[PDB]
Amino acid sequence: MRAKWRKKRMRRLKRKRRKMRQRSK
Amino acid sequence: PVARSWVCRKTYVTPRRPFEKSRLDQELKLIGEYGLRNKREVWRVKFTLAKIRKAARELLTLDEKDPRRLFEGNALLRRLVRIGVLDEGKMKLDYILGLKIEDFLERRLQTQVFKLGLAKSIHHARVLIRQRHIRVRKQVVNIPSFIVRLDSQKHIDFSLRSPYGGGRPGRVKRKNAKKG
Amino acid sequence: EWMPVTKLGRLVKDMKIKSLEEIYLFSLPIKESEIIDFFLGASLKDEVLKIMPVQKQTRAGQRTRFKAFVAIGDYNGHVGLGVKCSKEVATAIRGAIILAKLSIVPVRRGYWGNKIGKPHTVPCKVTGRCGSVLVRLIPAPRGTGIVSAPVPKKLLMMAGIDDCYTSARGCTATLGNFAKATFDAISKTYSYLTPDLWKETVFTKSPYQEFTDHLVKT
Amino acid sequence: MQNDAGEFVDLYVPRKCSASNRIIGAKDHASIQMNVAEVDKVTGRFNGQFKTYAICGAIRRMGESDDSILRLAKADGIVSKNF
Amino acid sequence: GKCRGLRTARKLRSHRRDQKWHDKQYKKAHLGTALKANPFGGASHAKGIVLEKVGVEAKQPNSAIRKCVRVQLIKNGKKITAFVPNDGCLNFIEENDEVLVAGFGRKGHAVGDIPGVRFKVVKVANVSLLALYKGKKERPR
Amino acid sequence: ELGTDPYEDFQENWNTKHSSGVTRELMRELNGG
RNA sequence: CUUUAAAUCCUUUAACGAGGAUCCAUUGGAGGGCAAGUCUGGUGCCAGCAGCCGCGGUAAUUCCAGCUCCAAUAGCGUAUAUUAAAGUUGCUGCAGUUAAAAAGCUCGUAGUUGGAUCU
RNA sequence: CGGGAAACCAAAGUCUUUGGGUUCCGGGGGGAGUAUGGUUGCAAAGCUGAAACUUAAAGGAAUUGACGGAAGAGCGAUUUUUGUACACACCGCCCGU
Ligand SMILES: [Mg+2]
Ligand SMILES: [Mg+2]
Ligand SMILES: [Mg+2]
Ligand SMILES: [Mg+2]
Ligand SMILES: [Mg+2]
Ligand SMILES: [Mg+2]
Ligand SMILES: [Mg+2]
Ligand SMILES: [Mg+2]
Ligand SMILES: [Mg+2]
Ligand SMILES: [Mg+2]
Ligand SMILES: [Mg+2]
Ligand SMILES: [Mg+2]
Ligand SMILES: [Mg+2]
Ligand SMILES: [Mg+2]
Ligand SMILES: [Mg+2]
Ligand SMILES: [Mg+2]
Ligand SMILES: [Mg+2]
Ligand SMILES: [Mg+2]
Ligand SMILES: [Mg+2]
Ligand SMILES: [Mg+2]
Ligand SMILES: [Mg+2]
Ligand SMILES: [Mg+2]
Ligand SMILES: [Mg+2]
Ligand SMILES: [Mg+2]
Ligand SMILES: [Mg+2]
Helix, strand or coil, X not given: CCHHHHHHHXXXXXXXXXXXXXXCC | CCCCCCCCCCCCCCCCCCCCHHHHHHHHHXXXXXXXXXXXXXXXXXXXXXXXXXXXXXXXXXXXXXXXXXXXXXXXXXHXXXXXXXXXXXXXXXXXXXXXXXXXXXXXXXXHHHHCCCCXXXXXXXXXXXXXXXXXXXXXXXCCCCECCCCCHHHEEECCCCCCCCCCCCXXXXXXXXXX | CCCCCCHHHHHHHCCCCCCHHHXXXXXXXXXXXXXXXXXXXXXXXXXXXXXXXXXXXXXXXXXXXXXXXXXXXXXXXXXXXXXXXXXXXXXXXXXXXXXXXHCEEECCCECCCCCCCCCCECCCCEEEEECCEEEEEECCCCCCCEECCHHHHHHHHHHCCCCEEEEEECCCCCHHHHHHHHXXXXXXXXXXXXXXXXXXXXXXXXXXXXXXXXXXXX | CECCCCCEXXXXXXXXXXXXXXXXXXXXXXXXXXXXXXXXCCCCCEEEEEEEEEECHHHHHCCCXXXXXXXXXXXXXCCCCCC | CCCCCCXXXXXXXXXXXXXXXXXXXXXXXXXXXXXXXXXXXXXXXXXXXXXXXXXXXXXXXXXXXXXXXXXXXXXXXXXXXXXXXXXXXXXXXXXXXXXXXXXCCCCCCCCCCCCCCCEEEEEECCEEHHHHHXXXXXXXX | CCCCCHHHXXXXXXXXXXXXXXXXXXXXXHHCC
């Protein structure tokens, strides 16, 4: 996998976690 | 607390390379020529020579007029001349570096018993020494590695109690005479 | 029977040059192997250091050749190294022996401390390079022996060195580079200007110039 | 060179470059040993005597053997002082 | 380049102290996570109870079934896969037996074809596997 | 009788399973050790 | 007998005590690293060996054995901590274009370093 | 000139003949610039930054071949143009669901 798209996938997964792993929770 | 002493040290160093053909051949030649039991007896003399060389090399870095050099090199040379490895004309500190392990091997009691004609083999010499047939000037010595000093060279003989040195016959002769 | 093809060979065969040091003085290249046989003769002993198979990729498949490394020396001040690649092992070994005795250099031997008796070690610290391999030779006291790897030790013994300390850096698993670096280090012993070589050089007749009349006849 | 007893202990004594004083090694094949003839001051013919110079290969590769030979010949009186 | 001042001892010592942490072995030995994760806890050997017998497939290009045992240590209760090295020695081990286990030789790293196995069996039921293999001692029973 | 030739064995098996052996033989043929 | 508080051990000494002198030396190996057999019989990618590279799928120099051969030797294997090997932590003494690597750029406090000259 | 594995570099020289001053910074390949803590921002994200575990290689320069929907000298292998991560050689190798 191209490193650029791997980095983008990691960032999207982290954003999804951040939405799920809410600071309020 | 106890009244004991714990001072002790090893008398040999094992080689770094376990299987080196040239070293094996040289050590086996030494063992065969001097009738030694194993490799450790070669390593012991090698360690002794290494220590003497290290001391001599440490004394050769000082100034010639240094009192400690004059005091200690004189003692080292005197001891080497006493045991017979060195000669009186070669009592400089540089000649110590020219000594070889065979020089120390030639001064054992086992080789001197053979060289003096008391034994007809080096192995026979070891057997004779270990069986209490040899005395050094008054004392029965049964240690093959006994290093003979120069002044003691003339005084190696059969013991007075030995069947060879004028003593009573041994067990086998007495039993065979009792047979007939 | 030997029939020389060069002036130096004709001079050597006709007993006009006394020693190989006369040739070494004028840095004359040696192109005939029979000169070294004439001078060093029986004292030369050689040893094969490595047989290395190399392969060239072709359309039909790999083509294999064998390379022999041979070190030679007389144990009394001269040493040489040769490398030869051939289709057969025996041919490569013969070529390597010839090439090794062709490139034979003298070795300078010095003292570590007091200068008593015959020289026993290298005059000073000398370094040789080959590829990534660096080899350093340091003088050692009398009776020390050679403290080195098995590969440099053979060349140092053939050169006639009794005592020496050795350091090495780089990929020494490359046996050819390891041997060539220590051969270069040994060769650099006579090219080092020490204070006892500061005297002005007195020139002498070259063998080409001295025996020109004899060369004209033959 | 020699031991404490004074006996010389060497295979041979290598010759040094006349230009740079460097030692000319046994495998230096770019070195030259050149002779320059001497002439009689009255007639100008070949005397039979010559002067010898030795140049190492390092100087020759630098292209500095011409100037070195010229200076050596000037120092020995072969080349005119008002060159 | 490095600083060569006469009063730079603090700089040099501090830099070396900080750059030693980028050595894998130094950090492994001085960090404490490896010691915490080590089932033996720093010991050369351990004793366990044989939970069961398993067969581990050898990694390619080799093909074989290496006989191992799942055991549980007595001092900490951790579960471990140990290798029983010899031809037919797995018949010397029974379930619920007590075994002495040592390392495999590479300091926590797997050895050879066996994947993820770093321990080997030494003694079973207080008798060495070598003596059982050579027929010098019998199982106590 | 000439039974084994180290040169032929090396030149044949230098890339086979028995290379490390035949090399060891060839050296014994060459250096005498 | 001596030893010792009394003993033991060592030393000293009577008598007995070795031909298979059965009064029997073991521990690891035999492809390379690394000293030493592509000898014979089994097994047939199985069982197993192998620190690493590797061996074993019907002629296995590597497994299980017999013979023979190596190494140290009253000692020799194994697991683990540690030192040298490591100039792979580099003060001596390592690197940073492409193998891991110089901050996007500049200013700047502390720190480090600092041109000649006096009999 | 001298360096370097070489490609190449008058600097990438004046290095085992190793010390002009000083700052940052690397320690086999992955896990991973990921988790967690701290901090900055409205957000997107920025800075600092692991371990458990897994693996015997990954990688650089150059050489000979094979492919292409392209036109005496070198340490050494070695001695139509060109590119290659192929060498069981494109019927290859290889990425993600
Ligand atoms: Mg290597
Ligand atoms: Mg297999
Ligand atoms: Mg055995
Ligand atoms: Mg066997
Ligand atoms: Mg081996
Ligand atoms: Mg061998
Ligand atoms: Mg493998
Ligand atoms: Mg069979
Ligand atoms: Mg068989
Ligand atoms: Mg260490
Ligand atoms: Mg060191
Ligand atoms: Mg390390
Ligand atoms: Mg140094
Ligand atoms: Mg490094
Ligand atoms: Mg990079
Ligand atoms: Mg920049
Ligand atoms: Mg400031
Ligand atoms: Mg000043
Ligand atoms: Mg440096
Ligand atoms: Mg890393
Ligand atoms: Mg790792
Ligand atoms: Mg050619
Ligand atoms: Mg060439
Ligand atoms: Mg392209
Ligand atoms: Mg190509």
